[PDB]
Design a protein around this ligand. Structure first.
Ligand SMILES: [Mg+2]
Ligand SMILES: [Mg+2]
Ligand SMILES: [Mg+2]
Ligand SMILES: [Mg+2]
Ligand SMILES: [Mg+2]
Ligand SMILES: [Mg+2]
Ligand SMILES: [Mg+2]
Ligand SMILES: [Mg+2]
Ligand SMILES: [Mg+2]
Ligand SMILES: [Mg+2]
Ligand SMILES: [Mg+2]
Ligand SMILES: [Mg+2]
Ligand SMILES: [Mg+2]
Ligand SMILES: [Mg+2]
Ligand SMILES: [Mg+2]
Ligand SMILES: [Mg+2]
Ligand SMILES: [Mg+2]
Ligand SMILES: [Mg+2]
Ligand SMILES: [Mg+2]
Ligand SMILES: [Mg+2]
Ligand SMILES: [Mg+2]
Ligand SMILES: [Mg+2]
Ligand SMILES: [Mg+2]
Ligand SMILES: [Mg+2]
Ligand SMILES: [Mg+2]
Ligand SMILES: [Mg+2]
Ligand SMILES: [Mg+2]
Ligand SMILES: [Mg+2]
Ligand SMILES: [Mg+2]
Ligand SMILES: [Mg+2]
Ligand SMILES: [Mg+2]
Ligand SMILES: [Mg+2]
Ligand SMILES: [Mg+2]
Ligand SMILES: [Mg+2]
Ligand SMILES: [Mg+2]
Ligand SMILES: [Mg+2]
Ligand SMILES: [Mg+2]
Ligand SMILES: [Mg+2]
Ligand SMILES: [Mg+2]
Ligand SMILES: [Mg+2]
Ligand SMILES: [Mg+2]
Ligand SMILES: [Mg+2]
Ligand SMILES: [Mg+2]
Ligand SMILES: [Mg+2]
Ligand SMILES: [Mg+2]
Ligand SMILES: [Mg+2]
Ligand SMILES: [Mg+2]
Ligand SMILES: [Mg+2]
Ligand SMILES: [Mg+2]
Ligand SMILES: [Mg+2]
Ligand SMILES: [Mg+2]
Ligand SMILES: [Mg+2]
Ligand SMILES: [Mg+2]
Ligand SMILES: [Mg+2]
Ligand SMILES: [Mg+2]
Ligand SMILES: [Mg+2]
Ligand SMILES: [Mg+2]
Ligand SMILES: [Mg+2]
Ligand SMILES: [Mg+2]
Ligand SMILES: [Mg+2]
Ligand SMILES: [Mg+2]
Ligand SMILES: [Mg+2]
Ligand SMILES: [Mg+2]
Ligand SMILES: [Mg+2]
Ligand SMILES: [Mg+2]
Ligand SMILES: [Mg+2]
Ligand SMILES: [Mg+2]
Ligand SMILES: [Mg+2]
Ligand SMILES: [Mg+2]
Ligand SMILES: [Mg+2]
Ligand SMILES: [Mg+2]
Ligand SMILES: [Mg+2]
Ligand SMILES: [Mg+2]
Ligand SMILES: [Mg+2]
Ligand SMILES: [Mg+2]
Ligand SMILES: [Mg+2]
Ligand SMILES: [Mg+2]
Ligand SMILES: [Mg+2]
Ligand SMILES: [Mg+2]
Ligand SMILES: [Mg+2]
Ligand SMILES: [Mg+2]
Ligand SMILES: [Mg+2]
Ligand SMILES: [Mg+2]
Ligand SMILES: [Mg+2]
Ligand SMILES: [Mg+2]
Ligand SMILES: [Mg+2]
Ligand SMILES: [Mg+2]
Ligand SMILES: [Mg+2]
Ligand SMILES: [Mg+2]
Ligand SMILES: [Mg+2]
Ligand SMILES: [Mg+2]
Ligand SMILES: [Mg+2]
Ligand SMILES: [Mg+2]
Ligand SMILES: [Mg+2]
Ligand SMILES: [Mg+2]
Ligand SMILES: [Mg+2]
Ligand SMILES: [Mg+2]
Ligand SMILES: [Mg+2]
Ligand SMILES: [Mg+2]
Ligand SMILES: [Mg+2]
Ligand SMILES: [Mg+2]
Ligand SMILES: [Mg+2]
Ligand SMILES: [Mg+2]
Lengths: 112, 137, 52, 101, 117
RNA sequence: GCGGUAGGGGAGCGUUCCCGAUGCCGAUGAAGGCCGACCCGCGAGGGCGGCUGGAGGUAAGGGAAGUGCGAAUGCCGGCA
RNA sequence: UGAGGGCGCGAGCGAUAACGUCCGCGUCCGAGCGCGGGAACAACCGAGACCGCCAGCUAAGGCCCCCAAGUCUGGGCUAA
RNA sequence: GUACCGUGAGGGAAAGGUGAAAAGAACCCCGGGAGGGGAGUGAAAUAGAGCCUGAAACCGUGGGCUUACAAGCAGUCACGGCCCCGCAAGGGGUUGUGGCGUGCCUAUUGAAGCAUGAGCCGGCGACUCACGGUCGUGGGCGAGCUUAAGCCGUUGAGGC
């Protein structure tokens, strides 16, 4: 069986966190835990959190053995970004885009 | 539906170059490189003969060509246009002229470079004796 | 706006081709002598201690 | 035995008994139609005078049919000229049998 | 009575886009680039529908000339003799007998030779 | 007999709306959407099949137009 | 529709210059940047494309290799 | 006639949609929350709350095919390999080699032009109507043809 978990509407650029999501893709739970634990990135926080919550969902709702689950799949999409007005020289005014991202991690049983 | 030739078999050949004129010999050689001599002709697969040339330094050529023909070659640098007469070309590596003459007559596409690889030239004679040494003239 | 400007929209293929090297490397770790937990080499870490 | 028939304005080679696609021939949907047009033979029969004067080949008109659509599309720029036609060159599938030349 | 653009403009577009698939880049995603490239493709197709003839004629001719040169004469002598022999046979293509059944090809070589002159 | 710009002529396709409508089609699933290598027409296009969707749709024959977009440094929005 | 243009031919203007200019007769492009040759080359050579064929014959141009077809036959010339 | 703009007169917007009923998701779980995973309600939760239907650009994940000696308006024709639907023959996807190939619209004597316009997608967008002419045209009548305002009627009923 597989077990999903999704943290949506995370106030952070998707492309940025994707670098982190790609670093744990197809890994052991322990492996991913360590990697995210010692990753120098900001996305590490949110990705690891939705990861842990994912494992929790897996064991408590899909009775898998934690001792052998892994990152079956993982990805991140773009949420409705936030446009913000931004001043500039000679009266010109450009708008900034405080983007956002939906992070998704799914796990599964070891082997059979 | 026209015949589609299956997996071919290579065919090595031995060709002399003593007394042979540059142009004509090079032309027949080029014709032999492609499979144009064989009724299984197919322009998109290339399956001609492994042409081998020996005694390249013995190639004839008419007129004051020896002293008058000039081989040009250019590097990206300014004034980098180098040019060497056929006399000095025969002074150093001689087969270079047969190779030039043949390549210049090959199809510009990649398979042309393939056919060019399938072409062996020396001036000894002797060669990779290998297996096949079928002489023609 | 002023002086230099991209003459053409960069193709997505070209863009990602640029992004080729952006990938991250996993942090290098070694198991510590004290606990079972992972440590980054030549550094001490909590849930542990040291000698001398 | 090898055989060369010339029908539909075109010359096909033919084995004894094989399915073939030829230009539409005005005949019954499933009868017999000898092709008096025939050249050469299996054991060599060079057709000196254009057609061999003493040979033939028999075939059954298996069925009529239409070819798959080929879009023709002319377009000359600068003068907004565009033309688009559909097309299906019809045909009959001949089934070859006896090679009684 | 008002009539918006409605379904129409989409449908049409979609249709053209259906042909566009297989093309590189925006040229297969964007309707406009798709249209242009489809035009050029249509013209190329129509032209190459005439190119196919020339191409196959040439291939055949080369093969014929080769196998014919195996016997001693060139393609010009071959066709001269063959057309002079009365054999309007063999739409040049069917000289594929160079490949399979080359003996028949050889007898044809003779029949062309003697009738040539 | 049939290259074809400006241009003239002929024949058609689709959109909305009315008569045909106290009708006929629609939960055994309307309109719209996604998919197709199938059917028909030279073509605009019509039809069938699978999926989605959830309350409308409108024959044959006629009628009337806010009726067909790829460009206007076009307009609005979305996104690179 | 009333900016036309190139080429050949007959003149003016210019300088028996111009991808110059202004007329006259014809031609082709324009509207044939559709097709084969002229390496590429709107108007020079060939030639007026309704559609399909992996049929045939010709045109200009060519028939040593790139590149399809004669290193064809017979007879002279040229040594650059 | 609000937000917002302008000292002022004035300018001037966007923004409608759960479901029959809120039955608006208790309780457990991860989490600081946000957000989810069960469970439950419901015909449907791919109706989960700016929530019916969810198109295109655009961004991602997995898969099939493919590429690191190759010169390209990105296509096309040909054969071949790998992959896939099908008894059959055939067909779909991809692209290896080979032949060929100077974007679209516009403005032009002439464009592939180093002339103009378009980043991309979706929606809005341009030959109408009124009266009066003019030829053609389908009909009614014909040395005649036709009424206008109005009145009567009706409430898509026409008549005088
Ligand atoms: Mg990956
Ligand atoms: Mg943070
Ligand atoms: Mg085929
Ligand atoms: Mg010489
Ligand atoms: Mg070199
Ligand atoms: Mg190429
Ligand atoms: Mg070599
Ligand atoms: Mg990618
Ligand atoms: Mg230490
Ligand atoms: Mg008939
Ligand atoms: Mg019968
Ligand atoms: Mg124009
Ligand atoms: Mg025009
Ligand atoms: Mg419109
Ligand atoms: Mg493709
Ligand atoms: Mg031919
Ligand atoms: Mg005409
Ligand atoms: Mg016409
Ligand atoms: Mg015009
Ligand atoms: Mg309406
Ligand atoms: Mg009504
Ligand atoms: Mg009604
Ligand atoms: Mg129901
Ligand atoms: Mg019912
Ligand atoms: Mg039913
Ligand atoms: Mg249904
Ligand atoms: Mg349903
Ligand atoms: Mg409607
Ligand atoms: Mg409708
Ligand atoms: Mg539907
Ligand atoms: Mg019709
Ligand atoms: Mg269709
Ligand atoms: Mg259809
Ligand atoms: Mg349907
Ligand atoms: Mg209702
Ligand atoms: Mg109607
Ligand atoms: Mg437009
Ligand atoms: Mg536009
Ligand atoms: Mg915009
Ligand atoms: Mg931006
Ligand atoms: Mg005037
Ligand atoms: Mg004038
Ligand atoms: Mg002028
Ligand atoms: Mg004038
Ligand atoms: Mg004129
Ligand atoms: Mg003139
Ligand atoms: Mg002309
Ligand atoms: Mg003009
Ligand atoms: Mg003309
Ligand atoms: Mg041309
Ligand atoms: Mg040319
Ligand atoms: Mg030409
Ligand atoms: Mg020349
Ligand atoms: Mg020249
Ligand atoms: Mg001439
Ligand atoms: Mg047709
Ligand atoms: Mg003739
Ligand atoms: Mg000449
Ligand atoms: Mg001639
Ligand atoms: Mg010669
Ligand atoms: Mg000679
Ligand atoms: Mg000679
Ligand atoms: Mg001679
Ligand atoms: Mg405010
Ligand atoms: Mg002011
Ligand atoms: Mg105020
Ligand atoms: Mg406004
Ligand atoms: Mg409701
Ligand atoms: Mg919940
Ligand atoms: Mg706090
Ligand atoms: Mg339901
Ligand atoms: Mg249902
Ligand atoms: Mg709410
Ligand atoms: Mg609704
Ligand atoms: Mg929705
Ligand atoms: Mg959605
Ligand atoms: Mg979507
Ligand atoms: Mg491979
Ligand atoms: Mg090299
Ligand atoms: Mg090229
Ligand atoms: Mg593979
Ligand atoms: Mg290709
Ligand atoms: Mg390859
Ligand atoms: Mg190619
Ligand atoms: Mg103007
Ligand atoms: Mg210029
Ligand atoms: Mg300018
Ligand atoms: Mg201008
Ligand atoms: Mg423009
Ligand atoms: Mg611009
Ligand atoms: Mg534009
Ligand atoms: Mg737009
Ligand atoms: Mg008008
Ligand atoms: Mg008038
Ligand atoms: Mg008049
Ligand atoms: Mg009329
Ligand atoms: Mg009447
Ligand atoms: Mg009348
Ligand atoms: Mg009358
Ligand atoms: Mg009045
Ligand atoms: Mg009046
Ligand atoms: Mg009244
Ligand atoms: Mg009443």
């Amino acid at each position: 069986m597989e077990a999903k978990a999704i943290a949506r509407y995370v106030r952070i650029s998707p492309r940025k966190v994707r670098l982190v999501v790609d670093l744990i893709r197809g890994k052991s739970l322990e492996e991913a835990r360590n990697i995210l634990r010692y990753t120098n990135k900001r996305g590490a926080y949110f990705v690891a959190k939705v990861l842990e919550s994912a494992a929790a969902n897996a064991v408590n709702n899909h009775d898998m053995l934690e001792d052998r689950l892994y990152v079956k799949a993982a990805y991140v999409d773009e949420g409705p970004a936030l446009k913000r007005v931004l001043p500039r020289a000679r009266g010109r005014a450009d708008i900034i885009k405080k983007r956002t991202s939906h992070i998704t991690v799914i796990l599964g049983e070891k082997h059979g | 539906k026209t015949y589609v030739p299956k997996q071919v078999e290579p065919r090595w050949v031995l060709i002399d170059a003593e007394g042979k004129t540059l142009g004509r010999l090079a032309t027949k050689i080029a014709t032999l490189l492609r499979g144009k001599h064989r009724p299984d002709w197919t322009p998109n697969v290339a399956m001609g003969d492994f042409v081998v040339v020996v005694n390249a330094d013995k190639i004839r050529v008419t007129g004051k060509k020896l002293e008058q023909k000039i081989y040009t070659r250019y590097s990206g640098y300014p004034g980098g246009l180098k040019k060497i007469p056929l006399e000095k070309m025969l002074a150093t590596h001689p087969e270079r002229v047969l190779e030039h003459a043949v390549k210049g007559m090959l199809p510009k596409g990649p398979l042309g470079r393939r056919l060019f690889k399938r072409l062996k030239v020396y001036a000894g004679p002797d060669h990779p004796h290998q297996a096949q040494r079928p002489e023609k003239l | 706006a002023k002086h230099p400007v991209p003459k053409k929209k960069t193709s997505k293929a070209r863009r990602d081709a640029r992004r080729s090297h952006h990938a991250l490397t996993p942090p290098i770790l070694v198991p510590c002598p004290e606990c079972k937990a992972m440590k980054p080499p030549h550094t001490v870490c909590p849930e542990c201690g040291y000698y001398a | 035995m090898f055989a060369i028939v010339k029908t539909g304005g075109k010359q096909y080679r033919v084995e004894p008994g094989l399915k073939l696609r030829v230009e539409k021939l005005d005949a019954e949907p499933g009868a017999t139609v000898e092709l008096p047009v025939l050249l050469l033979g299996g054991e060599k029969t060079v057709v000196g005078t254009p057609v061999v004067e003493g040979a033939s080949v028999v075939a059954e008109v298996l069925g009529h049919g239409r070819g798959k659509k080929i879009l023709v599309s002319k377009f000359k720029a600068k003068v907004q000229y565009r033309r688009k036609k559909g097309h299906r060159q019809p045909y009959t599938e001949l089934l070859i049998k006896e090679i009684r030349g | 009575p008002r009539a918006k653009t409605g379904v129409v403009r989409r449908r049409k577009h979609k249709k053209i886009l259906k042909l566009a698939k297989g093309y590189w880049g925006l040229r297969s995603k964007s309707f406009r680039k798709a249209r242009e490239t489809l035009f050029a493709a249509g013209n190329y197709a129509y032209a190459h529908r005439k190119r196919r003839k020339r191409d196959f004629r040439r291939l055949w001719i080369v093969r014929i000339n080769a196998a014919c040169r195996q016997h001693g004469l060139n393609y010009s002598t071959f066709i001269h003799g063959l057309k002079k022999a009365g054999i309007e046979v063999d739409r040049k293509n069917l000289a594929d007998l160079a490949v399979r059944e080359p003996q028949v090809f050889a007898e044809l070589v003779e029949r062309a030779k003697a009738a040539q002159g």
